[PDB]
Subunit: 230 residues, 6 copies
Amino acid sequence: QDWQLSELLENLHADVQHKLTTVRKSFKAENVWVDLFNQYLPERYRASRAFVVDSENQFSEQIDVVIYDRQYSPFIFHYAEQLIIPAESVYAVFEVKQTLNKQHIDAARKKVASVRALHRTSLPIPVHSPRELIGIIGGLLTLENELKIPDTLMGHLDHDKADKGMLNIGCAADDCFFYYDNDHQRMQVMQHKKATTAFLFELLSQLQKCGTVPMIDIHAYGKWLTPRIS
Amino acid sequence: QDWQLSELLENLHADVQHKLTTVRKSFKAENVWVDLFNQYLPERYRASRAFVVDSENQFSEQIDVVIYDRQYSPFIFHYAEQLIIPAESVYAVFEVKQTLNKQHIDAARKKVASVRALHRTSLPIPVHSPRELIGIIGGLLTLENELKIPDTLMGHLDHDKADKGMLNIGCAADDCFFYYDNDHQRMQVMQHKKATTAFLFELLSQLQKCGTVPMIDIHAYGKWLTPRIS
Amino acid sequence: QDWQLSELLENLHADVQHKLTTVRKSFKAENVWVDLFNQYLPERYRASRAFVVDSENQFSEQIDVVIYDRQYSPFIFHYAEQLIIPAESVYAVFEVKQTLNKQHIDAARKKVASVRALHRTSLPIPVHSPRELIGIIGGLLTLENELKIPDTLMGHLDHDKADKGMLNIGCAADDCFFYYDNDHQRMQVMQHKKATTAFLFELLSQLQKCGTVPMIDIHAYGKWLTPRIS
Amino acid sequence: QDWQLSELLENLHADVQHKLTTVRKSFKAENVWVDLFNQYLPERYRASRAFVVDSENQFSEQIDVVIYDRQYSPFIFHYAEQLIIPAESVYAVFEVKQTLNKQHIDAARKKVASVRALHRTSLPIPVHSPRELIGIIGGLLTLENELKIPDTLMGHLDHDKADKGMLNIGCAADDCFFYYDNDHQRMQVMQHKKATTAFLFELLSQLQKCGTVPMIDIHAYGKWLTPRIS
Amino acid sequence: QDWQLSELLENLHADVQHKLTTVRKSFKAENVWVDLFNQYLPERYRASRAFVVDSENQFSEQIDVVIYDRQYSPFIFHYAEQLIIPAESVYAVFEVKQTLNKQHIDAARKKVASVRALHRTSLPIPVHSPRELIGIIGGLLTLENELKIPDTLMGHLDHDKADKGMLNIGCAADDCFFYYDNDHQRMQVMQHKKATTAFLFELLSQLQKCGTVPMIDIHAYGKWLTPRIS
Amino acid sequence: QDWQLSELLENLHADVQHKLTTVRKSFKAENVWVDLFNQYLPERYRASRAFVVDSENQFSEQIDVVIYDRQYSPFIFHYAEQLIIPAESVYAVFEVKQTLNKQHIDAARKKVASVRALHRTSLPIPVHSPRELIGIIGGLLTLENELKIPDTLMGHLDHDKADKGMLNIGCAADDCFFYYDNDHQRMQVMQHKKATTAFLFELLSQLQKCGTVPMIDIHAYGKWLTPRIS
């Protein structure tokens, strides 16, 4: 029963997972999630606490966990010891909060909203048309779920897809994960003892369906240095 | 005559090649082949001794050398100190045996057969159609060729393409290498003093023609953790 | 005014930039440019002093700075301590000279011409047609501009696109950068205090528009080791 | 005047130094100091935020910057994402506070005192006598000095060597650094534009005079796992 | 009860420890022990499967785990993919066997004996006298203990110190560990659930008491290349 | 005859050695020697082209190969892309020249003389006395020896030990190495086909007998930033 695919999946990155459960039990956070994501995610992706910036000199607020393209990113900024990432590079943004409740849900929606409100550029490619903008994943990462009734959480998580604050995924470590399905066109909540690894696999699945990074308009950033003649 | 492209090609990764010739002469193995491949192959690929697993909880036997996609692999399992790789990540599988003879050919074909019999998934992409499954390269890596007659080896290597045990490529270090050509639609054997480097270039050429990793169905692995509702 | 996108852009890789300005002031070089490029460029690219070779056993002269694809390159050669790069891997080639004048412009054009005259291969892909050959960027990297009149430099830089010596981009550190625009179908010179970073953003933009590496014909290099039967 | 030893000294690790000055100007912190120390210090040393623990199951409070021996440390602990360092490994402990004033001086003295009150072991060596315990350096790292009168800071920093809270060194970035001299047997304050680099050289000098790590009594930690018979 | 020194000690390198327990349970090996040691040991030491060689062209048999000085070693040999270490660099040598029984004890003693029988050199230092030769630690590493009676294992482990096969330390993973005490001048066996971590701390303690690598007589190896005149 | 200590010694770092022989045959250089040394030398040492500087603001000329203490060095400077090393950190200095003749011998003696003329500091240690200054090894590294008569080279290499230009060691790759012996109190020349590896082992032997880095007077460098009160 060791060489059971089920067992291999649970044992995958066991150590970082164990760090998260201890934190959950010490509450009964932020850095563990960043660590967790960077272990599970393929090389193309990196996770970090960070601000997001766009080529219109607009900045998000500090985002507890940003997942961005490290491999094909043309630049990432460092002010002091802070990371500032171009919006075009961002795949997902998460709020971290100890507890999953109506208020932190709303707090997550506002952080996600502030990133999606940024302006992202996308060029055409040799001549194809410019690529559709990636749909940025928004979520909430918590240690203890305070909405024990699946109805009392289902309700406060029903948000419209046009809404820029909508949460695509979220987790209460070792307790439950939720996510939005398109086939079903609804939110779905799953209460499971292994919800952290199941949440991660869901995340990998949504990342895989995001789409390829569009071509950044590098001149839309370079215009902050020199003029252009039409 | 040093700055001759011919010489540059022979000098390429000269050290790992020298390790292989010594082993050939000490016989008159496994770790050398893995080292050799990991030096010649581009960053996308990695070679390792490993088991292969599929999302149906089927396992190959231990494969002396697996070449897999390390860059775009969503997960690789580590049981004890053993590597277990999802079948969708596999480009090539090799049997290592001291001598190239009818029996080790058959032993190679059975290992290859066991990996290709695994179930591999492939999703559609945004909506394109799902990508064709990669054609997994199967081979046999040896130190000394015991079929000196090119007719006596040609015969025991003529296998049908529809057969899942068919060997696409193989080598007897510093002696000969064989491979299947599609234009010619047959096997081809080459006896050459520099057969190790020529075998590697043939491998690089087949890898290049494999195709891109299909999109793994991550939920087909994630189902081992949580149910899904249709 | 610290958290101004303008300031973030200037502060990006500030240290290597500072190394370049000191050299400019010590003249009032080569290694600084290589260092500079390897910090600004995304992971796919690497910069290095090197010779370029093709599958016809032709070699360029030593190129002060080659930008090549390290991620998807199937091989790079090392004679002694010299780097020798297959022409198919080359994105850009630069001459380095202390001063920007008519003679070093001509010297750059001849080095660039010698690389573009090499033979580059390109295969079809599964069956699509073989990819168009990348357009290799040629430039000239200098410390002090000796053509102060924008007319007196504009003139000696007007070359025809069909000419294999034509220079696509160039820089006189912390003074000016030039580049060819297709929309405008002319050369363009920009005299700016921050010309080094603006030059780099222009380079990133041209690299982005280059196209993906064509599929190298590995057998056109492997033919240097073994014969082929038609 | 570039190749002036004075200039080389100022230019040393210029980039991390620049990060510190920006923070100083943004206040007009913690991570910058750690970054700064890890660049200036030789390989034997590492700096990190951390708790300190002894073999009597006593813990300090969280220490903003601990400098410990990473080379010869037999173990370092990781609770969740927290670093916990055996007291025997500690060379220096620093409080970080935006401003240098009487209250943050006292706050530093209490943190330093809590580390020096821990129990540190030291064995004999083959048979020589057990090494004297290292004298742990205590300091205070700030951005802006609020005691402008050198008398008004001198006074609140005159402490006795027998006191476990005594501060050996401290800095107000790009403004002043203080330190205790044994020859002089007093504190000394230095107000200098380049006070950050001078502070660092003073730190290197005190570290050099600390003494080599004593031999840790590993069984005094191992007793937490198994009993011993006398 | 998480921030209990006891708990930190048990959690230290928890992952590699877990790998070892699984192997113990799959038996109800070699690579796990090497991995385990390389995580617990300080930077000075490295563990590896290897042959040991001396300057008299004598070789041990293959040693399942050798612990050697990687930091101050002047050379290590690589034949094929095998590691060959000069005897002067060796701190400890271990036999790995699934079960702890009289026969594997004897097999361990014979491997240890073969390494200690090698000739080790030691020069004087500036002029001090040559350093005493390190006492090489010998042990046996197993998964399951088959001598359940502590008298039935005590008996077959009482060996004289003057014997070159004597075992200084050994372990049956998560079950028991033994070691020789000099104060007590006997062997000591400890049966404990956490015997793996306690065994490691005992190993660290013995390594610490070994002594410093003597100065290797480099010319005693160099004589294999050129003559010397007296 | 493969597992012959003689063979292992010749095979040690075979690849970098092969690079050197090719250069020797292409002459019939500098970077190969640096590479060679960094492969053979233990971790404490690093080799690099560099200037040497002392705390009296004196600089050597550029030294083709400096061997310095990277591990215990408190600082190393970087002007532009040049390395500048404090004299106290230097173990050996070499001139590189294609041919070994009277003139390049004299050229080497002058470079060595210029480094040894620098001022090196050395403090006392807790209170022991200050350590004797390391005896800096001087040598000459060449590809072809033009003094074929061992008398015609013996003569031009007899220099007095008090002379600051004296050469302690040198090599004509794959041809001969010389060195100074104290027992013999003379120079010694050895003509051997494997002279490169024998030269390296001689170098390792002299390095081992150099002595430990003395304690640098860090304030003798820090005085370039701030005054001191006696």
